[PDB]
Design a protein around this nucleic acid. Sequence first.
RNA 1: CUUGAGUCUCGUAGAGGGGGGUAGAAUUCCAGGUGUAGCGGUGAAAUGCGUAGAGAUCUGGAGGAAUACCGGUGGCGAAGG
Length: 64
Amino acid sequence: AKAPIRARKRVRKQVSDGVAHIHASFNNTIVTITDRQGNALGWATAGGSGFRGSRKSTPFAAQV
RNA sequence: CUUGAGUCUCGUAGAGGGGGGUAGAAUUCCAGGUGUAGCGGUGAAAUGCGUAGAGAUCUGGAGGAAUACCGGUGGCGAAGG
């Protein structure tokens, strides 16, 4: 019967507020979330979000 | 003789020259924390770097060159500068 709702296993750390850094360049854009005291909390990128080619340096790819 | 040319005091502007020190931003490298799979590159790509933990990100150190903006048809210089 059962068909699932929860998106992941239960939350970890839990910090309420953070800093993000967007390193935007002519070939690729990297978005990296951190804590105020300097800790990566996760990242994703245009190239890792499955664009490649010329699409890798586009505002639409940056969004995704 | 004194208009030429030289000379004296008072001042002014400027990256003019030489010798010493010093400060910040940044690329780099080493060190350590976080953190996950690409990163880097182009017309597109591959070689490269990456699952031995890179890229990004926070801290600290090392070093060496240059010295943003101001800077402008600007200015100084015998010219190169």
